[PDB]
Amino acid sequence: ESADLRALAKHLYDSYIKSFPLTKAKARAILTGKTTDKSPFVIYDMNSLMMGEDKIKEVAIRIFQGCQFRSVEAVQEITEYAKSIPGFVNLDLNDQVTLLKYGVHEIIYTMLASLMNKDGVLISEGQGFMTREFLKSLRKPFGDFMEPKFEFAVKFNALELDDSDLAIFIAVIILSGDRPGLLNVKPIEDIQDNLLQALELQLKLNHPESSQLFAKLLQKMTDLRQIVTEHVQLLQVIKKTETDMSLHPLLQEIYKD
Ligand SMILES: CCCCC/C=C\C=C\[C@@H](O)CCCCCCCC(=O)O
Ligand SMILES: CCCCC/C=C\C=C\[C@@H](O)CCCCCCCC(=O)O
Q: Most buried among 49, 152, 178, 233, by the most CB within 10 A?
């Protein structure tokens, strides 16, 4: 029954809005100009960065640390969202942990695209905008940190998905039965099956003229895997070049594959 799938799509979108304070709908309103009361302050260099802190220790390190906090906060939002996916909290606790461990960064980059355009990324709940060029000019090895995320976003954003679409896609990512170390794959696959059915119907109804959007979206999951791997390799470099900088415990536990 497509009625049961629509109900599921609704539930997930409702939960998504309740779990993520900054939606794509709001991110785009800020970025496009449906503003006057939502205009962000733009950081494109040092002085503007200094000016930014006023109404929003080398530069690179500070920016990376703030980035760590936001990532940790995002893990929290995603964990809260995960609990609303029917069947998730009823799985073996060890598996719930494994799914989150491997799913959170793929979700972080998927949603990060909502805050990006080819010129930069929204920061601090949308109050600021840091240009891609500025980030690209940070000393090594931080200058190459975000570039791959922007490249992904530019392409991913071309799919023109909205929050109701993303809510289901994110649920699909979390319930991946192929994650390393899963104890009971079957119950997870059965849940993903239902989620895949919901995503398929949603895309057909929400994007009637977008042929094979469903398949094109699932293929993006390959891009997300890639991004994580490179990111991990870059993190390895930072660990060794900055021995005076500390990586957040939660994040360390996540990468401790
Ligand atoms: C140093 C960067 C500061 C970024 C803060 C900007 C937006 C954060 C908003 C969150 O609270 C709730 C929004 C839902 C999470 C999805 C945002 C995209 C992502 O960060 O993965
Ligand atoms: C050093 C470059 C910092 C650029 C920060 C600009 C936008 C960031 C938005 C955040 O929500 C998402 C950033 C996640 C990147 C990785 C964070 C660390 C990690 O979780 O591994």
A: 152
